[PDB]
């Protein structure tokens, strides 16, 4: 496994810019970079970019 820090989406998010990602509830976000306290970066469904940290739940 090379998925890094992962999280499960709690809410639907639609990317609002070419540097953001989108996800639906229960999608998995992989290789998360907790780069800022509000916006994180990670990989979801083939795209890498920013998303709201509080839209996901880190996997324990």
From Swiss-Prot:
It is found in: Cytoplasm, Cytoskeleton; Cell projection, Lamellipodium; Cell projection, Ruffle; Cell projection, Dendrite. It comes from the Eukaryota. Residues 4-60 form the SH3 domain. Expressed at intercalated disks in the heart (at protein level). Expressed in most tissues, except in B-lymphocytes or plasma cells. Acetylated. The SH3 motif may mediate binding to the cytoskeleton. Contributes to the organization of the actin cytoskeleton and cell shape. Plays a role in the formation of lamellipodia and in cell migration. Plays a role in the regulation of neuron morphology, axon growth and formation of neuronal growth cones. Through its interaction with CTTNBP2, involved in the regulation of neuronal spine density. Plays a role in focal adhesion assembly and turnover. In complex with ABL1 and MYLK regulates cortical actin-based cytoskeletal rearrangement critical to sphingosine 1-phosphate (S1P)-mediated endothelial cell (EC) barrier enhancement. This is Src substrate cortactin. It comes from Mus musculus (Mouse). The lineage of its organism: Eukaryota, Metazoa, Chordata, Craniata, Vertebrata. The gene is Cttn.
